[PDB]
Amino acid sequence: NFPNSTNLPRNPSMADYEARIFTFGTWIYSVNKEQLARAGFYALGEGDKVKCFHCGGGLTDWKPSEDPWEQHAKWYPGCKYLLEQKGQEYINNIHLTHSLEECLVR
Numbered sequence: 001n002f003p004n005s006t007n008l009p010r011n012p013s014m015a016d017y018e019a020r021i022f023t024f025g026t027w028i029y030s031v032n033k034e035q036l037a038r039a040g041f042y043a044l045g046e047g048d049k050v051k052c053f054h055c056g057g058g059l060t061d062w063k064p065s066e067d068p069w070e071q072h073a074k075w076y077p078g079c080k081y082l083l084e085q086k087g088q089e090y091i092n093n094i095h096l097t098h099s100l101e102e103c104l105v106r
């Protein structure tokens with residue numbers, strides 16, 4: 001499914017932080033639910049799988065070192081919610097650092 005790159009959220013029912021919070025329930029996982037919700041994510045009830053309310057972008061297998069905002073940027077760089085909240089300069093930073101993380105191991 002293609003990532004939503006318009007200024008209009010794919011899932012408007014999940015546009016409020018509070019609405020997103022409710023989707024998690026008791027959350028055992030490596031990453032903080034509040035932090036996820038702040039980064040636009042709501043839980044699907046399929047392990048730790050989350051989707052952004054805006055771009056629709058899905059992410060799973062959250063490691064303790066993985067930051068919701070950085071991951072959002074890494075995998076869904078066209079997301080307009082991300083651009084609004086963080087700005088393009090943060091977005092470019094994250095891409096630069098992840099691209100440079102690759103050439104440092106490769």
Ligand SMILES: C[C@@H]1CN(CC(=O)N2CCc3cnc(Cl)cc32)CC[NH2+]1
Nearest residue numbers: 049058059060061062063066071075
């Ligand atoms: C949090 C981090 C996410 N990472 C990538 C990931 O989960 N991706 C890459 C694109 C994609 C599409 N659809 C789903 Cl469901 C997941 C996903 C894996 C390690 N943990």
Ligand SMILES: [Zn+2]
Nearest residue numbers: 052054055079
């Ligand atoms: Zn998004």
